[PDB]
Symmetry: D2
């Protein structure tokens, strides 16, 4: 196999750039895919009852043609993200609609408009080829990838690339994602691999760490400062496992919300002290399908004040959506910020605008991160200031079970996936820095 020869080169440890440039490309690669003819297979079911194991296929797919500004990457490991779940249950809409619309832009984007969709929005691996116009990256470079896909032909994105009208998420709104043995990315998605981490560890921060960085740290989100109090929903999940770290390292005080004593213990291991278990408290923010209960908003606010000495939070880190959003707006301090990048429990938000306008609060929408933000987030991992939060690793063939874990909220931290890597534990080339941080690196491990 051409693919076995590629893996052997990576595992040897002493292949030069010219060696990678000399390997023959395989004619197909193994990939986790959706099929277009199945996009209605879950019609009539409740979201909970839609099973990613039924929709996710392991296929052999042809290599796409390499274009200008792009790189072909040999993927050692990837991760399950919530967009992998959304894709796999075809909610809110089918990703094939996104691929069809993308394919209308040009003959190059039309490569993506296929009857199958290779998923995955994270990777760690090795560059094999680069297209025309690519100088910064070369075959053999060890990389991780962020998932922003921007074309930058329009002027709109030249003062923050998230504002590009053609901005997409790689592996979700584009094809050739990371849950596969090979991937195709733009080279402006590439970042240097953290040397003290294994392949699966290095693949795990990309998406959620970059998003948490823009949403909480950067001036394009909440602009955290030391001394702030920050309410962090889902503090032991993917986003929250990085948000909590940024709050603590930035000198702020996180109030972490989780739903089990096991996750509460992890938050204490990260260094948080103020932890609310929403299951034990039994919050019912909605009385029925159409009306909320302000008494329950107020009970949450009172519990926060027990931890802060009577202070309300400067920032709410939102993402659960409809269930929690009325409470989030209510409990925020006068002049404070609710920053939101998601709506897991439902995107039709309801809130009492009297609390927003009379208290001069703001709701800031945030979405992934631009390259500069993704670089800064990955830099803090490489410096050993922010740590990966991997809890469990699955084989590529078992990506469906990994997606079901997240779908049903059975996990903590990040769930990783081995792609070409034959086992866990490979890829560390800075053992001294790894040993300095190993206890924190393994804090989420089962």
């Amino acid at each position: 196999r051409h693919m076995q020869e590629i893996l052997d080169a990576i595992l040897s440890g002493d292949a030069a750039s010219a060696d990678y440039a000399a390997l023959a490309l395989p004619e197909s690669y193994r990939a986790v895919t959706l099929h277009k003819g199945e996009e209605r297979m879950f019609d009539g079911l409740a979201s909970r009852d839609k099973d990613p194991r039924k929709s996710l296929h392991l296929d052999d797919v042809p290599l796409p043609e390499l274009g200008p500004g792009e790189a072909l990457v040999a993927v050692m490991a990837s991760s399950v993200n919530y967009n992998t779940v959304w894709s796999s249950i075809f909610e809110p809409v089918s990703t094939f609609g996104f691929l069809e619309r993308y394919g209308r832009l040009s003959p190059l984007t039309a490569r993506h408009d296929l009857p199958y969709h290779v998923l995955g929005s994270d990777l760690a691996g090795v560059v094999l080829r680069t297209g025309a116009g690519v100088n910064a990256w070369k075959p053999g470079d060890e990389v991780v990838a962020h998932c922003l896909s921007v074309e930058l032909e329009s002027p709109d994105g030249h003062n923050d690339t998230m504002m590009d009208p053609e901005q997409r998420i790689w592996g979700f709104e584009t094809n050739f994602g990371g849950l596969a043995q090979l991937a195709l990315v733009k080279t402006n998605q590439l970042l240097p691999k953290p040397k003290h981490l294994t392949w699966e560890e290095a693949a795990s921060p990309g998406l959620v760490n970059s998003t948490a960085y823009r949403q909480l740290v950067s001036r394009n989100g909440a602009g955290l400062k030391q001394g702030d109090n920050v309410l962090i929903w889902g503090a032991s999940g993917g986003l929250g496992s990085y948000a909590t770290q940024y709050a603590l390292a930035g000198g702020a005080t996180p109030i972490c919300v989780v739903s089990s004593p096991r996750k509460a213990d992890i938050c204490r291991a990260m260094g948080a002290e103020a932890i609310i278990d929403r299951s034990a408290e039994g919050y019912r923010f909605w009385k029925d399908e159409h009306h909320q209960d302000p008494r329950e908003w107020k009970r949450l606010g009172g519990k926060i004040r027990e931890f802060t000495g009577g202070e309300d939070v400067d920032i709410v880190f939102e993402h659960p959506g409809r269930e929690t959003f009325g409470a989030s707006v209510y409990v925020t301090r006068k002049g404070g910020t609710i920053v939101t990048c998601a709506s897991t429990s439902g995107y039709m938000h309801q809130y009492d605008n009297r609390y927003l306008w009379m208290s001069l609060k703001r709701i800031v929408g945030s979405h992934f991160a631009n390259y500069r933000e993704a670089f800064e987030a990955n830099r803090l991992v490489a410096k050993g200031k922010i740590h990966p939060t991997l809890s469990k690793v699955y084989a590529l063939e078992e990506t469906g079970q990994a997606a079901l874990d997240v779908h049903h909220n059975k996990h903590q931290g990040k769930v990783g996936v081995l792609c070409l890597a034959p086992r866990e534990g490979l890829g560390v080339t800075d053992p001294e820095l790894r040993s300095k941080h190993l206890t924190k690196i393994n804090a989420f491990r089962n």
Copy 2:
């Protein structure tokens, strides 16, 4: 009263010096529009609509209050009747006497406001007569208007933007000695210089809705308007929206004005706007039923906006109607744009589709009234002739009851003013050249 008449004579002469005002003997009573503590339940049982301010508002002669540190006594030439004045006059949401009594427990200074009568009114235009201890920047004779937000600023919270202060009082509503009277008492950090090209009644008009619109649309605490922006303005001929339309035009931006009648569209054209949507003629139905919205109506509004902008979506939505329009407001905003909100007239339980907010990196910014720097800047743009008052009708002080009913029942398209000491309309202009340049717009809301 002889002393009061001599004060008015000094003002009307046009050439009294500061020393002359300092030498005028103060009156020992002044005429004022008041509520009476004994009557606060006279409307119990009735619907808001059927409560009549002519039955609760009294014309009384009241004694002058003692002038404290950092305060000014003002001879009032004109004032205004706004929604806060109307609600007070019908003891809604609760009687104003409740707060005057509680706050009056703090100190002998706060207890001056706790009286069996309440002098209403949160606007004035007039002349400073006396200042209390420590005052530097104002002197007898200075011609002034007032910002009605009073802050004590003992908490640190308000020292980077005073709207964050936790202890605000609206003068004439949560304080006594308001402006619907011949004299008023205010803090000197409420005073603003009178625009010289306007009459007394015009200068008292812009008031809180003008500074609120300025903070919401122009200032960096709100939307931070820049030239070239497209701005969707709901209620563009009402209080807030009329000033927002003017700020958009004055700042080099394009307002897309929304109104509900052809008469209102004509007022918008008179202010200088060109892109006008009649929401009633278009028949928008943003809610399908009590609990669900219709995204195809959001998109129909979006397509109508694009007809005026050459295919562009708005950088800013100037919100205030609330529940009925808020879903559409979030939908139509450009990627990276801002929805600024300072009220919820149609209902405060907002519902919107958050996918549009996070996937297009939009933000919803809450704003409320204005701090004193914003009020100074808004008033300064009126004084420069960039922003014009919106007066429709003027009443004498003796007829404040009817003025209040007119506002309560929405009888006029623009503001209702009240003459206090001024004997007739049309006095107080000392810059006729500037007035002549802007006369048509100044009178756009007169019939």
Copy 3:
């Protein structure tokens, strides 16, 4: 002649995109060029004595090959600015040095490394062909260009592309510039042509306009708001003339500084009213080569207050540098901003920091403009809020004389160049908006 038929299509006014796509390309185009062998010809001379008429050639050159994300444009008009003049006299160094070094990177970048250099960093014209991947532009589109190109391989420029470490000015650090019948640009340099302007007027605002927009209007510079008072140095020059217009269009008050009565008249024709003639006032901000005179800073401040009713300016629009900068910091209001994008009179600035910290002022550096700011500035021209400042137009064959005119500061406004356009005055397709603004459009004629 294939070139003649391209011009006839443009002049017909009703060719469709399919008609442009069907036209045969010419094998060569007429271009204004420098020659590699002559780069030492002005060795020994003072700058003022170098004559661009001796170095600029009119050549027929072959068409370059069209790469990914590029467009081939038929050029109706161009401009001559200071970058063009500097290149034509090989200052500060010959432009061929950078073209050679950059052309080592790849076959794409080596297209630019030729023995001749086609100059010009402005255009107005019609798209003829686009390279692969191009979505937003098609044959027939009427365009102007933003001259600053970025590669954006580094993350640094992905929150504001001016932070990118590898910028190139098209026609100066690239070949195939706009002083020619055809040009090659990236598609993320293209902007829609303002319909109410002639070809030569549309090509004129260019980089000084977008630089002024970034410095004064955008949040990356001073963040102007209506009501502000703005001190504008050099108010009838390139930057200052656009800055004056942005101040007015944004509802602010420019306090315009000029050095002659004729310049004051031009400021009044633009709409300004508060004008200071620094030469009539006789300001001497420096007492000698090393020390300033705070009494003269204060004298300027007092003159400003005569126009503002006693207020100090919220913003100073700086660019003269050493001579004026101490005065600029002094006169700015408490909490105000001094924004700077050049140092004409000298880059070693000196100022009294007590005024800066005790009055919480800031000095903000700005440079050129990113593509979003260039689009917004061009859009305000297209709205008729901002007007071009052309003084004189030359034919392409006379580009040498045009460059000498700019080099010796012969005109008060800009110098334009007809490329394919056979005469001035063509290209207006919005005559109603033009008629509204004709007097201001011609203020520098």
Copy 4:
């Protein structure tokens, strides 16, 4: 030592006086204070600033109590500190403070109380409220307080969106009278903050001025707006401002590059948690080659040394205050897009820099000055929470304030130099012993 003053101190020291007990104490008719005299403001004319001796101009006087006004408090001062503005005052540089008092005195009959032939100095205090004026409801006799030094009238609209912008804004004890280097002081009640209970009187007095300033300059959005990951060049990292700036950089998750002039100060920086330390004396930087011209080669040498510590990165922020000597280098070494934030010019206020580095690299120079009440509250809250620690090195008696000021004038100190006012000895005033115990090693990091 008068009887009424002795009775006030006995009440404080008893630990159990009630608010009504302080209200009932007789006030003294005079108090002991460190003062300047108007007749002497020319005494150093023609001398180089280094040769001006604060021991010659600072007097210990008995002065009459001023009349209490609306919005004010009379405070019994247990301890204060020397600040550099105490040094500036005592050498009448750049100008005499009596010009400031004369100008202030023209505003109103209330501000005219300050226009006196002597100037009571001091811009920090820790102590106990004795009396409050009209309009004061938030503070009462007996409250244990520290004071920040912002004096704002807030009559003008300009200060109502950040009070530092008030046109009449002044620094208490420098541009106003009745400062804190004295047994009693007069302040606006909007200068008052709750005393941190785990600190002694002298420790609690020491952060106010420089900690508030460093917070606005580095942490707040009105200054540099620090974020975790930033590299920050901190001049004078073991002095007053620097000893707080370094703590904010570390606690905010940034990397300070600390500049000091001795190995002893380098060791304190390491004890604070910094690793990247430059000794400007050992490096021998000569940024100026003569009176009128700088040396870009030395700017470059500093920039190269910084890059050795950061792995090749240039600093996002420079925390400036030395002024003329360093400012050209500070602008040069800053990263593209970065910020130089300045609140002072110790070495000379006529700054010179190369504007090509500022405009071509899109840098900005942000002027900062003290802090508004909200920022001062936030800075003091972080001390009270034990997140930021006092940096007191040495304590002098009130009668030795002249020598304390000379220490700072000649750059012989580290951290903050404290002064006992009414407090009879060091070590008093702690009422949270368990929080103190948790943090004691860091609290004492600067002690001789």
